[PDB]
Amino acid sequence: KNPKSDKFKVKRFHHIEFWCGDATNVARRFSWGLGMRFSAKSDLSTGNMVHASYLLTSGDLRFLFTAPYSPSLSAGEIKPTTTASIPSFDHGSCRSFFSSHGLGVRAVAIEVEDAESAFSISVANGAIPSSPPIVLNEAVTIAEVKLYGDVVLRYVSYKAEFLPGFERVEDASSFPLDYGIRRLDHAVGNVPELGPALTYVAGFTGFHQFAEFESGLNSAVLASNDEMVLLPINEPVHGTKRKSQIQTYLEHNEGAGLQHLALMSEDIFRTLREMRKRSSIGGFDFMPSPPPTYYQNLKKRVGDVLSDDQIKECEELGILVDRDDQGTLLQIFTKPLGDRPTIFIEIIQRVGCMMYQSGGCGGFGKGNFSELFKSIEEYEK
């Protein structure tokens, strides 16, 4: 069931912020590789002497890329006189984050009704504060609490254009790329111990465990009331023949952090075609495809959902398919987005659970561990 125990009003995923060494180059790579438009900036040209921040958008999906300038540019500033557009930014925290983790997600931001209420109630309920509520131009309130590792859960709330002090990019620089991605479906964290992580986060949010349906991990999923904010969390399982990829993550990331973002497409076939066309010319690479035996086995499992043509199209693109009690899930995983084997991206599309589509329709692919192992016995063939 769903007890709907959110301790404050949570709306939707609002944006994801990457902390970078150079925001320009990461943003331009992601824009081409994923098909996202440059839509806002806050940097030297907008008066920001503290950080460079570039926003990419695709549908409702908002990726923010931020890097620090030299502290010398803003050395005479103090917090009351700051030119930073994101008041929680701090040169030392950002350099320390990036040197410790490399390229990765600093903030998972959700839109709430009242960011100040959400911050107070969260801290009242165990959340470790990270940046207190700050009202920007009497219009937007932002607050941050620790999520896991050095990742913050950022609350944003609007009285009624991204953030004050961001400018819309003059569209001579804004090329209308679009490969079909429309919103963030869920965000996945890796921790050394799942239980305490769950207890902490569920402790201060009231998010409930999302109901689900021997290789490497245990996981569980936290969800908001309407189950549109979904936050899976993994822990490693040790002693296994193949080393736990969760453990590999923790080693190369220097501890807990965000493992991957799941991006919903409105047409996963066109998204993967478009992304794969660009893999070797600046975009993203994809995990190796499952063997043909995996795809033959797809008819017996989802032959009622997908035509033979649609199945054959899943095979051309390397798409995985899983199915819940309520819907069917199409998914695929990129290779790591940067130098370290840490953060990656998953492209997904859900079919079923109409009534709008309810959140998590089809689950998260748990069934594909078994299906891929058994399929990999294609050595017989």
Ligand X SMILES: O=C(O)Cc1ccccc1O
* Interaction pattern, residues 74-103, with its own copies; x per rule: CB under 8 A: ---------------------x--xxx-xx
> Which range of residues in 43-51, 131-139, 313-321, 363-371 is near ligand X by CB under 6 A?
363-371
Complex with Co ion: residue 269 or 333, whichever CB lies closer = 333
Pick from 152, 328, 365, 375 the residue near ligand X by CB under 6 A.
365
> Which range of residues in 226-234, 303-311, 333-341, 359-367 is near its own copies by CB under 8 A?
333-341
Q: Looking at residue 326, what DSSP letter applies?
A: S
CA distances from 232 to 102, 189, 309, 317, 364 (A): 22, 6, 32, 26, 9
For residue 70, the partner it binds in ligand X, its own copies, Co ion, none, with Cβ less than 5 to 8 A by kind, is: its own copies
d(C-alpha 50, C-alpha 167), whole Å:
16
For residue 155, the partner it binds in ligand X, Co ion, its own copies, none, with Cβ less than 5 to 8 A by kind, is: none
Taking CB under 6 A as the criterion, which residues in 214-273 touch ligand X?
Answer: 219, 232, 234
Q: Are strands 181-190 and 257-265 parallel, antiparallel or unpaired?
A: antiparallel
Examine residue 137 and tell whether it contacts its own copies (CB under 8 A).
no
What is the end-to-end Cα distance of the chain in Å, rounded? 43
Taking CB under 8 A as the criterion, which residues in 232-261 touch its own copies?
Answer: 251-252, 254
Crossing angle between the packed helical segments 308-317 and 268-277, to the nearest 10 degrees:
30
Amino acid at 151: V
For residue 234, the partner it binds in ligand X, Co ion, its own copies, none, with Cβ less than 5 to 8 A by kind, is: ligand X
User: Which SS3 state, helix, strand or coil, does residue 167 take?
Assistant: strand
Task: Give min distance, CB of 276 to its own copies, in A.
Answer: 12
Examine residue 170 and tell whether it contacts its own copies (CB under 8 A).
no
Pick from 52, 151, 184, 275 the residue near its own copies by CB under 8 A.
52
Read off the tokens for 230.
């979904």
d(C-alpha 36, C-alpha 18), whole Å:
15
d(C-alpha 280, C-alpha 125), whole Å:
47
Residues 6 or more apart in contact with residue 18 via CB below 8 angstroms: 26, 63, 64, 65, 66, 103, 104, 105, 106
CA dihedral for 82, 75, 21, 340, sign (positive or negative): negative
Q: Looking at residue 255, what DSSP letter applies?
A: S
186 assigned binding-site residue: yes
Pick from 26, 152, 201, 317 the residue near its own copies by CB under 8 A.
26
Residue nearest to ligand X (CB): 232
313 assigned binding-site residue: no
Q: Looking at residue 244, what DSSP letter applies?
A: P
For residue 52, the partner it binds in its own copies, Co ion, ligand X, none, with Cβ less than 5 to 8 A by kind, is: its own copies
Sequence ranges of the binding site for Fe cation: 186, 260, 346
Site residues (vs ligand X, CB under 6 A): 188, 219, 232, 234, 364-366
List of residues contacting its own copies (CB under 8 A)? 20-26, 28-29, 31-33, 38, 43-44, 52, 67, 69-70, 72-73, 95, 98-100, 102-103, 172-175, 177, 251-252, 254, 280-283, 285, 337-341
